[PDB]
Amino acid sequence: ANQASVVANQLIPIQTALTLVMMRSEVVTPVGIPAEDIPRLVSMQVNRAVPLGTTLMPDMVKGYAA
C-alpha cells in the first residue's frame, strides 16, 4: 500500500512517554498505528520495550484508542 505506520526511530524503553524524536513514518507490513497519528501519541506511554525499527501497534500504547 501507500499506507505508512509509526515505526520506532530509537529503542523506546518500557514505560517511556513518547516524544517526536522516537517516531518515524514508514510503509511496513503488518500495518501498525497510522503515521497520521504521530501528533496524538506524544506524551503517551508504551507498555513494553519497543526496539529500534519496530512498528508501533495499538496494544503497545497505554490509553491509545483510535
Kindly describe this structure.
With 66 residues, this protein is mainly β. It has a single domain, classed as Type Iii Antifreeze Protein Isoform Hplc 12 (Alpha-Beta Complex). Helices cover 6% and strands 12% of the residues. The longest helix is centred in the middle third of the chain and has 4 residues, at 38-41. It is globular, with a radius of gyration of 10 Å. Residues 5-64 form the AFP-like domain. Its main location: secreted. Contributes to protect fish blood from freezing at subzero sea water temperatures. Lowers the blood freezing point. Binds to nascent ice crystals and prevents further growth.
TL;DR?
By secondary structure, the chain is mainly beta. It has one helix at 38-41, and strands at 5-8, 23-26. Strands 1-2 form a two-stranded antiparallel sheet.
Give the tags:
antifreeze protein, Type Iii Antifreeze Protein Isoform Hplc 12, two-stranded antiparallel ribbon, mainly beta, mutant, 66 residues, monomer, 2 strands
Sheet having the most strands: 2 strands, antiparallel
Q: How many domains is the backbone divided into? A: 1
Class based on secondary structure composition and strand pairing: mainly beta
Question: Got a strand count?
Answer: 2
Gyration radius, rounded: 10 Å
CATH homologous superfamily assignment: Antifreeze-like/N-acetylneuraminic acid synthase C-terminal domain
Strand content: 5-15%
CATH architecture classification name: Alpha-Beta Complex
CATH topology: Type Iii Antifreeze Protein Isoform Hplc 12
Order of strands across the widest beta sheet? Answer: 1-2
Tally of DSSP helical segments = 1
Distance between the termini: 20 Å
What is the H/E order?
Answer: EEH
Instruction: Assign the CATH class.
Output: Alpha Beta
Describe the global form: globular
The level of helicity is under 10%
Keywords: Antifreeze protein, Secreted
Subcellular location: Secreted
Site (Important for ice-binding): 10, 15, 19, 45
InterPro entries: AFP_Neu5c_C, AFP_Neu5c_C_sf, Antifreeze_III
